[PDB]
């Protein structure tokens, strides 16, 4: 039995452990040195302090999915931290999790959802196309992190809700 609600940790480091595993499972598309960035729990707090929200998906009490919503302005919000556990992918759960976040954004008053994603993330790019997102631009995003300089081929997308 699968449930979606606002995220609440079952134990203190649950989000950190789930996130690190999702990030390590996607080596081509994400910054891997999570120790050099603020914790995912601080990210959630930043979202909520600016009017955003962070959501969970659980099978029983087992976390299997996460998704964030970050406001840009009065009418535009950004999807972020969209992840489903490997064993539960490709069954329709991610689409259902997205549809919950979109409905929540629509009720809050957002009329546009934007996002960016690495081109290596094939499943996500197919889903966003299925959901009706439209490409804005492609770009090789340069990120300097510590003693490294990383290059991510990235897609930017928008969807109008109303
Ligand atoms: C804004 C951001 O956060 S960008 C970061 C996005 N996150 C990632 O890339 C992390 C890695 N991927 C994932 O965690 C997940 O696959 C998600 C969250 C992107 C998608 O959730 P899933 O459970 O896999 O998706 P779901 O089962 O609902 O599939 C929906 C659509 O995704 C696409 N898709 C899913 N699985 C596959 C697959 N194996 N091959 C190709 N396309 C696929 C299809 O378009 C599918 O629609 P369909 O079933 O009608 O053909």
Author numbering: 0 to 161
From the primary publication:
To gain structural insights, the crystal structures of HP0935 in its apo and ACO-bound forms were determined to be 2.00 Å and 2.40 Å resolution, respectively (see Experimental procedures). ACO is bound in a tunnel formed by the α1-α2 loop, β4, β4-α3 loop, α3, β5, β5-α4 loop, and α4. While the ACO is bound in a bent (L-shaped) conformation, the pyrophospha forms hydrogen bonds with residute moiety is accommodated by the P-loop, and the pantotheine moietyes on the β4 side of the wedge-shaped cleft (residues F81 and I83), mimicking the hydrogen bonding pattern of a parallel β-sheet structure. The adenine moiety of ACO is stabilized by hydrogen bonding with side chains of residues S89 and N125. The carbonyl oxygen of ACO’s acetyl group forms a hydrogen bond with the backbone amide (NH) of the β-bulge residue F81, which may stabilize the tetrahedral intermediate during the acetylation reaction. The apo- and ACO-bound HP0935 crystallized in distinct space groups, C2 and P61, respectively. In contrast, these regions were well-ordered in the ACO-HP0935 structure, with a significant conformational change in the α1-α2 loop. In contrast, in ACO-HP0935, the loop shifts toward ACO, adopting a proximal conformation. Despite a low overall Cα RMSD between the two structures (1.95 Å), the α1-α2 loop displayed high residue-wise RMSD values, with residues N25 and F29 shifting towards ACO, by 6.00 Å and 9.44 Å, respectively. This transition constricts the ACO-binding cleft, likely stabilizing ACO and facilitating acetyl transfer. In contrast, in the proximal conformation, the loop is fully ordered and stabilized by interactions with the β6-β7 hairpin and symmetry-related molecules.
HP0935 is a small (161 amino acids long) single GNAT domain-containing protein belonging to type IV protein acetyltransferases. A biochemical study showed that HP0935, the only known protein acetyltransferase in H. pylori, can acetylate free lysine amino acid and lysine residues in proteins. The crystal structure of HP0935 revealed a conserved GNAT fold, characteristic of the GNAT superfamily. The structure of HP0935 is composed of seven β-strands and four α-helices arranged in a topology—β1· α1· α2· β2· β3· β4· α3· β5· α4· β6· β7.
